[PDB]
Ligand binder design. Structure first.
Ligand SMILES: CC(C)Oc1ccc(C(=O)Nc2cccc3c(-c4ccc(CN)s4)ccnc23)cc1
Ligand SMILES: CC(C)Oc1ccc(C(=O)Nc2cccc3c(-c4ccc(CN)s4)ccnc23)cc1
Lengths: 247, 238, 289, 38, 247, 238, 150, 38, 49
């Protein structure tokens, strides 16, 4: 026989181990493969699909109403319209998104984000918005001439309905962490703010109030690392009829 | 280019002057079942233009309080024309679908419809342990209404529903949506009366609004089955 | 004609026929041949390329899984007052005691195979002290060798018998026995008598005699009693099989014979194997909507 | 993996795909035709 | 020595494992092989042999009487003669057949069946029958002009005694299951029905009543999968003399 | 072709004008034992035409209540002609068999006999733990009757008995059956007085019926041993 | 007896339900732990797990003859062993499992909504093989599944 | 290391780096341009 | 039947083709409008929206 000795970790059950194991049904022939539409091979393909942000996460916004932001004509120049918290770990407009939900199975992330906004007013409605990303370090800007100093796009409503703001990967480290300490220097991304560049201008027969839908996706420079249990789901009890499977 | 479209299938044709391109679901096109994937050995009937043509459903009124609408395929077409007759006389069915959704308003109207085709849209019930019954699911040609579109009536997420094949009708931009659906099943064919491959959902994420004089703003659905095959001829269940 | 079959056959597309003198759906059962009508001849077919494997119905795979052949419980105790298996038992080896293996083997007339034997031991305290990690000895006693009379008899010295010693804390003991018939195959059924006189046993081929399995606890008894259960599993391997048989329908009565009674009423009654339906026009599980 | 000296010790032999079902389905001395059999 | 560690499943006894094991009788020479008629190498060879269906599984049919169906001259046109339940899992005319018994050691099945019927009336008896297979979905047909819409053969009695109805594999899935829920969409095969196409016509000196024997076999497109304990046999006690093997 | 047959072995010949082809069991033909399979080293006697010829047994009457009949081989022939003499004087025997079963009736009769050759037909007793005795099994030239043909008297199945070499006599179709049996044993030779390789079973699965005037309808069995060899000459047991 | 399903523990359920169709083999790990009922030490028991497919008979008793396992796959394992481990192949009658099923299981209207009959695995039956001791114990069995070849 | 006879017994297959995200991100029949999309 | 779905837009006008669908090579201008040699069928207009 072969002389052998057992190492530390002999007999352990590691849930991420990767070995062959004994086939319980010998000579079983699985059903032939068939082409099915929509095969996924990397989860990064899913986070590249844009999905609606819950920007109007306010009391008295119910259900579908939380997925849109209403804009009205103002009488003061350059007013703030809304801001978007960029925390994916803490609860906020980005959490329940395809990029958000998949990323919360991971601990580390890197790469650029795109926010796309679709204007859903009438054809006769006109306006210009400025959308700003502020890199981290200070407070969220409350005035347009402060927010204008960051990365921004000036959006004119027109035949093309939608504009993209890229949030470029601007970070000291290779990765950020999905950290519950949102103010940590390893976690904070900064802010997105929207201001009036001009005004929403509508004729009498159009509705005086118009909506934006915001979407977010990852770009293909995006990467995720260190898999973890997602905090999005849990159970305190057995589910209904889970017991009946033993009966 | 992308704004005008004509669709011609059989004796039916549709033109639109305000398309927004169109969606081919997962980049596939409908096809007939090849011999290397086939299971049932009887020779299929392929009725072509008798089945592979646009059928128009009853229109629904878009209202300020609308939650959105749904139709299940093949269930909504199982009683219509020669598609319905072949469904009733055959045990097995396979097809793709061409879906065209129509809604127009004035340049003073605003509103946005998400038009999404969901594969295997297994519904949940709200606030009960009891599963949805047969009459909750099998609405036929009339379709159903969303109870809680915000969770797609399945404990999930309207916001992430863009992961499915979809377009929008944004009344400012366009007045029709087009989705081409391939066959989408774990089996190569199915019994058309007990399983729905696809659900068309139309959800008003931005509500209809205007300050002009109000009019009825209907939403109309036209569906063409594509590459229909039927196997297992018998008497009609009907 | 003999051929290598790895997958179920393809179907070819077929057209309309209408040919005089050609009647592929007519047959003559009286010849004893099975119907040769192909599906392509009965109906119009499509082409199907068939990828379904047939390996799980190979006779090797059908029979080569381990099944219980023997199960014996005995008292492990001081036996001086017992009247009983006194820390050991003897088993006359057979395949007829547990019906699941028996019915599968009896699908064939002749079988040639080697036997993979797995011995599983379990212990319970008699009515707690913990469970002792006992050593067992199994000894194979061929025809004409002397079987042990006692737990400590000198037969257990096993000068030429094969013995295996195994612990309860071990994995199950395992050995292979070769195909050991004096013929080229075992007789699963035997329409004959075992001896030259008329009183010999009907139905057992003397050629297939394996011998005895003797199992003792090697430890001396403890001050308290235990119950030890030994389970023997057999897996046929390297199998050849000849002349397939109609399966057993009525419950087995005896390990010694094919005697039969049936269940009191159908299913598997002597008068009625299939359970009744109200008429030949009654569909029992008819779909109704 | 088989280091035993006796070949009957080996694992099972699941590779014999030869069939001849005609010895049970067609034991007629004159073969059937695809054609009146009698 | 070689450094080693034990995996999960070390020391298990799996009844379907496949390893070499220690030879108990070294240098033993097995008896030379001899040619024996009738070697079987795949169980699918057995299910291809046709065997009698117990179609007359009715009370007051005893023993052999259950293996035949009696046909008489009728005075109404196109009458139903019998139907055959196609459930192999539930008890019915197909269970105690070679294809039936072997298949019940398995869970999954695919492929075509043949039913052959032998007419056993006198030479002077004449008649035509229609044998119909109905694919699943509705109730079993009770009229000839309903059953005629399915797959069928019209059988004229003649010098050739026997007709085959093929039941072709018509299924959405690659396999069906031997499921105790006979109405499951993964299990139900549909129905076989027999009607008069004309009538049984006999002269006075022939017997007025004639019999069919029905047979079933698999075709060679047939496949079985996932081996299981067959529910056809069981024991509640030790058998007689099983104890005496310990004495 | 398939309907008429002549069999000639030794001084005996049979003609039939209503055969249904004939069965060669498992596709084999009888042969003498080759040297590479032989065990007994003495030179065998091979009597040829003295043994390898048709012997006709006593006929049995087919009746409305018949359960069927059986004969065991070699037991039924062990006392007949020169085959029987060689059996009685020799320890070891080997042969094949040619079985021909005869039954004719009018064109107004109906009935079907399953004619099946069963290897190693180990019988069971009904409703007892006691195994069948010597006189239950060894019926000789007269043969036996089935007690429960539905289970083949062995707890098994008439319905599945078609797995064995067989023909039918369907009175409408044919009036004779022929089965050729090879040597069928686990050993190359056997003691002919204690083991039967084959059992001929004739079972009336469809009963005899007519409305003509009744006649006796006999079933007759003719068996030819084929390629007989005998080893171990001694005095006759007889 | 356990009727095999993936829907009982939400962490695995939510991950699987990110997809419509999945094809995979299942690596199964069986972990057993024992506590004395209210000390005597812990017995090193032998367990039998037996897989009972659709239409096979499930055991009625600890000592029923169903446990003889003539054709069912069984694994016998000790509590002192490492966890028992086996792989089950992809065993759907379709080319993929239906993680969601917008359909009904039977040809009548009363069949279950939402479960594809094609994805039925079967039953896991687990017994202690030892006879009972004079004192009681509580035995807990945990089953782990790892998808692979996805 | 895989000494089992069935290929489904093997360890996991973590080597498939093929992607096609456009089947979810760009299912439009006429491809986007880098240029007014409508 | 044969139909076209017409969306109002920059192009003002839509064509419906009535294809020649007839058993015979020709139809007749017959005063019996219900004659099988004469009747062409119908054109109908509905609201699609
Ligand atoms: C002590 C140890 C070193 O050796 C042994 C030796 C034997 C055993 C044991 O039980 N074998 C066995 C148990 C059950 C059956 C058999 C068979 C059969 C083949 C055909 C049959 C029909 N009649 S029976 C052959 C050899 N064996 C068998 C266990 C251990
Ligand atoms: C006794 C031993 C020899 O064999 C076994 C056999 C099975 C088990 C066991 O629990 N498996 C399992 C536990 C949980 C799930 C499964 C699955 C699923 C794939 C997709 C599903 C959605 N419906 S479910 C498939 C096969 N298995 C499963 C444990 C041991």
């Amino acid at each position: 026989g072969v002389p052998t000795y057992l190492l530390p970790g002999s007999g352990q059950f590691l849930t991420t181990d990767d070995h062959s194991s004994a086939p319980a049904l010998p000579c079983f022939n699985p059903t032939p493969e068939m082409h099915i539409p929509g095969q996924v091979r990397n989860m990064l393909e899913v986070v590249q699909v844009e999905s609606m942000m819950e920007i109007n996460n306010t009391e008295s916004a119910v259900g579908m109403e939380r997925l849109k932001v209403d804009i009205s004509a103002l009488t003061d120049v350059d007013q703030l319209l809304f801001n978007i918290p960029l925390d994916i770990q803490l609860d906020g407009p980005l959490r329940n998104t395809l990029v958000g939900n998949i990323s919360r199975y991971y601990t580390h992330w890197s790469g650029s984000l795109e926010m796309t906004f679709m204007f859903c007013g009438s054809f006769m409605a006109a306006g210009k918005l400025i959308l700003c990303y502020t890199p981290p370090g200070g407070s969220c800007p409350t005035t347009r001439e402060t927010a204008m100093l960051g990365t921004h796009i000036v959006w004119d409503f027109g035949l093309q309905s939608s504009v993209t703001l890229i949030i470029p990967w601007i970070s000291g480290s290779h990765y950020r962490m999905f950290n519950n300490d949102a103010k940590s220097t390893n976690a904070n991304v900064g802010y997105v703010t929207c201001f009036m560049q001009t005004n929403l201008i509508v004729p009498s027969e159009s509705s005086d109030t118009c909506s934006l839908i915001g979407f977010i996706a990852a770009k293909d420079d995006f990467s995720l690392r260190l898999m973890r249990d997602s905090p999005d789901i849990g159970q305190l009890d057995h589910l209904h009829a889970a017991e009946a499977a033993y009966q | 280019s992308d704004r005008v479209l004509q669709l011609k299938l059989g004796n039916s044709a549709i033109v639109t002057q305000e398309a927004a391109n169109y969606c081919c679901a997962y980049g596939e096109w409908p096809n007939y079942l090849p011999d290397h994937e086939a299971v049932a050995i009887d020779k299929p009937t392929q009725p072509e233009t008798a089945t592979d043509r646009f059928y128009t459903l009853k229109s629904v009124k878009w209202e300020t309080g609308s939650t959105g609408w749904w139709w299940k395929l093949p269930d909504a077409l199982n009683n219509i024309g020669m598609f319905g007759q072949n469904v009733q006389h055959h045990y097995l069915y396979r097809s793709g679908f061409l879906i065209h959704v129509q809604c127009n308003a004035t340049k003073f109207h605003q509103g946005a419809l998400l038009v999404v085709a969901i594969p295997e849209h297994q519904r949940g019930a709200h606030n009960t342990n009891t599963s949805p019954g047969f009459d909750d699911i099998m609405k036929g040609e009339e379709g159903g209404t969303f109870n809680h579109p915000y969770v797609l009536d399945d404990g999930t997420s309207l916001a992430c529903a863009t992961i499915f094949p979809h377009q929008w009708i944004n009344l400012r931009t366009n007045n029709s949506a087009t989705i081409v659906l391939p066959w989408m099943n774990a089996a190569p064919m199915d019994f058309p009366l007990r399983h729905n491959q696809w659900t068309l959902a139309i959800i008003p994420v931005v509500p209809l609004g205007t300050r002009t004089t109000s009019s009825m703003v209907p939403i109309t659905v036209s569906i063409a089955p594509m590459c229909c095959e039927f196997n297992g001829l018998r008497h009609a269940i009907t | 004609i003999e051929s290598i079959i790895k997958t179920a056959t393809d179907t070819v597309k077929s057209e309309i026929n209408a040919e005089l003198g050609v009647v592929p759906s007519l047959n003559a059962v009286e010849t004893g041949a099975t119907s040769n009508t192909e599906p392509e001849e009965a109906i119009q077919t499509r082409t199907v390329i068939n990828q379904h494997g047939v390996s799980e119905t190979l006779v090797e795979n059908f029979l080569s899984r381990a099944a219980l052949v023997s199960k014996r419980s005995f008292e492990y105790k001081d036996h001086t007052s017992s009247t009983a298996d006194k820390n050991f038992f003897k088993w006359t080896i057979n395949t007829r005691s547990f019906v699941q293996l028996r019915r599968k083997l009896e699908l064939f007339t002749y079988l040639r195979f080697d036997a993979e034997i797995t011995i599983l031991t379990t212990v319970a305290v008699n009515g707690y002290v913990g469970l002792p990690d006992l050593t067992l000895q199994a000894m194979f006693v061929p025809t004409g060798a002397l079987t042990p009379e006692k737990q400590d008899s000198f037969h257990w010295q096993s000068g030429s018998n094969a013995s295996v010693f195994f612990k309860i804390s071990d994995p199950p003991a395992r050995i292979t026995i070769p195909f050991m018939c004096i013929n080229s195959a075992y007789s699963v059924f035997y329409d004959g008598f075992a001896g030259f006189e008329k009183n010999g046993l009907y139905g057992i081929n003397p050629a297939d005699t394996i011998g005895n399995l003797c199992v003792r606890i090697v430890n001396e008894h403890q001050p308290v009693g235990f119950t030890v259960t030994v389970r023997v599993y057999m897996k046929p391997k390297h199998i050849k099989a000849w002349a397939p048989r109609p399966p057993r329908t009525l419950p087995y009565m005896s390990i010694a014979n094919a005697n039969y009674k049936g269940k009191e009423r159908a299913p598997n009654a002597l008068s009625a194997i299939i359970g009744n339906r109200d008429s030949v026009k009654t569909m029992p599980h008819n779909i109704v909507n | 993996i088989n280091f035993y000296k006796d070949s009957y010790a080996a694992s099972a032999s699941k590779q014999d795909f030869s069939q001849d079902p005609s010895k049970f389905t067609e034991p007629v001395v004159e073969g059937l035709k695809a054609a009146p059999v009698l």
